[PDB]
């Protein structure tokens, strides 16, 4: 199954309001190399996602998890709603590295970010309307 890394990077580059040239100065890839990556002519290796992840400001493993969502579902709900994922992932990272109840009970910051988003959607509660302490209390309930 295809990895769809070309569409993922082009979508995330536009989400970060970066031109192909500005990303080119961070990654070190040429503007033509970046264009061929986004279009699909040149394949993107596991070491190129690492370079793209640092250039975009996103941990590279989230780009792998988005590519895995494409293979399993045909689409990526995280990529479709990345703004809500970005804001929600900031809360779990602050909670993971500052709260012992999360550090000693967490399993996967990506997986727990999705379920945390799903539980706000379960209550149909909008992100960005939520507080950090409000999400932390719910974070500790999912982790017993």
């Amino acid at each position: 199954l295809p990895t769809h890394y070309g569409t993922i990077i082009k979508t995330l580059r536009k989400y970060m309001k970066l031109t192909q040239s500005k990303l080119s100065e961070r990654t070190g890839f040429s503007q033509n190399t970046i264009s061929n990556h986004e279009n699909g002519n040149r394949n993107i290796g596991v070491n190129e996602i690492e370079i793209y992840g640092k250039g975009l400001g996103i941990p590279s493993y989230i780009l792998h998890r988005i590519s895995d969502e494409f293979k399993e579902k045909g689409y990526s709900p995280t990529l479709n709603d990345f703004g809500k994922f970005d804001k929600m992932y900031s809360y779990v990272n602050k909670a993971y590295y500052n709260d012992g109840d999360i550090y000693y009970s967490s399993y996967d910051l990506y997986d727990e970010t999705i379920k945390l988003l799903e539980l706000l959607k379960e209550s149909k509660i909008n992100v960005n309307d939520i507080d950090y302490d409000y999400v932390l209390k719910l974070y500790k309930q999912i982790l017993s």
């Binding site: 493993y61 550090y103 000693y104 982790l143």
Partner: protein, 131 residues
């Protein structure tokens, strides 16, 4: 920089990853589904081979959540610099229940522990402390 090189032995192997730059080790993911029996053990294969940077060895260290929440300890854990086989994670399930590991679950982390490679020299001195 220092580089930790790896190679996937199968399609099921996962790329080791950190969440932040200051993470102690790279998370190791299980390449298969398996069950760790109660008061038992299991060797989780990652389907990767590693080449460590100079001046260190590879310590398979436990993950905090899995150890505390599921009563699991990591045995062995010493990966020599010249080992190029499948990296296996030895897991001891001390709980009264079986634990089910899923493909992609982060079962441990690989820390590049700086060590000394010294020469051994036998002494006939009875060595005494200086306190």
């Amino acid at each position: 920089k220092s580089v930790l090189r790896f190679k996937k032995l199968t399609e099921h192997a996962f790329t080791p990853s950190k969440g932040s730059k200051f993470a102690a080790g790279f998370d190791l993911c299980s390449a298969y589904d398996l069950v760790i029996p109660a008061v038992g053990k299991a060797l989780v294969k990652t389907d990767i081979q590693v080449e460590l940077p100079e001046g260190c060895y590879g310590r398979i260290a436990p993950r905090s959540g899995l150890s505390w929440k599921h009563h699991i300890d990591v045995g062995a854990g010493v990966i020599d610099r010249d080992y190029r086989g499948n990296v296996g994670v030895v897991l001891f399930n001390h709980a009264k229940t079986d634990y089910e590991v899923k493909k992609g679950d982060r079962v441990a982390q690989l820390i590049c522990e700086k060590i000394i490679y010294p020469e051994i020299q036998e002494v006939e001195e009875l060595m005494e402390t200086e306190r």
